[PDB]
C-alpha cells in the first residue's frame, strides 16, 4: 500500500512537471525568437560591411 502510494505521488509530481515544462517552452520560444531576430540583424549588418 505504501509502494502504491509512492508510485501515485510520483505520477502527481510528474503532471506538475509536464505543466511546468510547457510554460518554460513558451518562454524559451519567445526568447529564442528575439535572439534570432537580433542575430539576423547583426549578421545582415556584418554582411553589408564585408560586402
Amino acid at each position: 500500500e505504501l509502494m502504491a502510494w509512492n508510485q501515485a505521488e510520483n505520477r502527481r509530481l510528474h503532471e506538475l512537471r509536464i505543466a511546468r515544462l510547457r510554460q518554460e517552452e513558451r518562454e524559451q520560444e519567445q526568447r529564442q525568437a528575439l535572439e534570432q531576430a537580433r542575430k539576423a540583424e547583426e549578421v545582415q549588418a556584418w554582411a553589408q560591411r564585408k560586402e
Binding site: 509502494m3 509512492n6 509530481l13
Partner: protein, 58 residues
C-alpha cells in the same frame, strides 16, 4: 541506519530523486524535485520508516 549504504551522485540527471534498493530486489523511486528537505524526510519515513509502535516494542 549505520548498515544502510548511502551513496550520493551530483548533477547526473536534470531533476533530483532518491532511489532505495530493498533486499527483495525491489526499487523505490522517490521524486524530490520541488519538495523541501522536511517533506523529503517525512515522505521516506512514511513509505520505508519504522512506525513509532514498532520502535517502542524494540
Amino acid at each position: 541506519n549505520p548498515w544502510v549504504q548511502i551513496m550520493m551522485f551530483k548533477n547526473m540527471t536534470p531533476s533530483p530523486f532518491l532511489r532505495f534498493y530493498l533486499d527483495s530486489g525491489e526499487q523505490v523511486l522517490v521524486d524530490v524535485e520541488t519538495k523541501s528537505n522536511k517533506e523529503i524526510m517525512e515522505h521516506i519515513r512514511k513509505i520505508l520508516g519504522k512506525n513509532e509502535e514498532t520502535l517502542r516494542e524494540e
